[PDB]
Amino acid sequence: HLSDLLQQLTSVNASKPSERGLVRQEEAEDPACIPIFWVSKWVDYSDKYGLGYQLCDNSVGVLFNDSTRLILYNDGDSLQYIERDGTESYLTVSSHPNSLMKKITLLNYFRNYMSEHLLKAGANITPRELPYLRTWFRTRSAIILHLSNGTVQINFFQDHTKLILCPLMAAVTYINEKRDFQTYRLSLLEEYGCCKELASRLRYARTMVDKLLSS
């Protein structure tokens, strides 16, 4: 899915989408393609444990420093443990192995923090009709998050803009400075252009996706 994403982005960036005689970004807006999942909160505690996050359906997840993941579903009981090599086990809180009690405890600590203390990104948006965090890194400018369903999210720290890239829909959601959420089909930005702000963010995305590919 990453290879596809990189190709979609390269293709948009090659068409010089901000350099058209008239840019019609609004023509590319596609509400069909609004994603199902995105990361609405996150906490990096990789100094000790890992990266905690919440997805827009209120499921919570941790990627542990040992590259394993534990996910609590929005029902508050179902878990999925994903091992370093991707192997999945389905469990519950009411009846878990004791071997996972540490990780479930940690999971509850992230859950309570995120619930007590953080704002839900895209909270006004209805997603369209569960993945885990494959990986993440932070640059000086942003945090990049790569989900197991192929989605890449990027959150830029200074201005608080976010991009959500989905290679399945070949679509991008931009959350701008005023907290407006607009979703675009990549093939139509290729046709009708976009503003320099979005075009700049997409050039950066292209770059971050080639970092994800060499790791």
Numbering used by the authors: 373 to 501, 508 to 593
Give sentences copied directly from the paper behind this entry.
One of CSFs, Emi2 (also known as F-box only protein 43) inhibits APC/C activity by binding to APC/C-cdc20; therefore, Emi2 blocks the ubiquitin-mediated proteolysis of MPF8910. Subsequently, the phosphorylated threonines in Emi2 can be recognized by Plk1, which undergoes phosphorylation, and these phosphorylated sites serve as a recognition site for SCF, another class of ubiquitin ligases; SCF destabilizes Emi2 and activates APC/C10. In this study, one of our aim was to elucidate recognition of Emi2 by the Polo-box domain (PBD) of Plk1 using X-ray crystallography and biochemical characterization. To elucidate the detailed molecular mechanism of recognition of Emi2 by Plk1-PBD, we determined structure of the complexes of PBD domain (367–603 of Plk1) with peptides Emi2146–177 or Emi2169–177.
Furthermore, new peptidomimetics (699, 700, 701, 702, 703, 704, 705, and 706) that we developed according to the crystal structure of the complex of Plk1- PBD with Emi2, were introduced by microinjection into immature mouse oocytes, and the resulting in vitro maturation was analyzed. To identify the binding modes responsible for this strong activity, we tried to solve the structure of the complex of 103-8 with Plk1-PBD. Unfortunately, our attempts to crystallize the complex of 103-8 with Plk1-PBD were not successful. Instead, we obtained structure of the complex of PBD with peptidomimetic 702, which has a phenyl substituent that anchors bromide and methoxy groups at meta- and para-positions, respectively. The structure of the complex of Plk1-PBD with 702 is very similar to the previously solved structure of Plk1-PBD with 103-5; the latter peptidomimetic contains a hydroxy methyl group. The distance between Tyr417 and the oxygen atom of the methoxy group in 702 was found to be 4.7 Å. This finding could be attributed to the orientation of 702′s functional groups toward Tyr417. The subsequent hydrogen bonding between Tyr417 and the oxygen of the methoxy group in 702 determines the strong binding affinity.
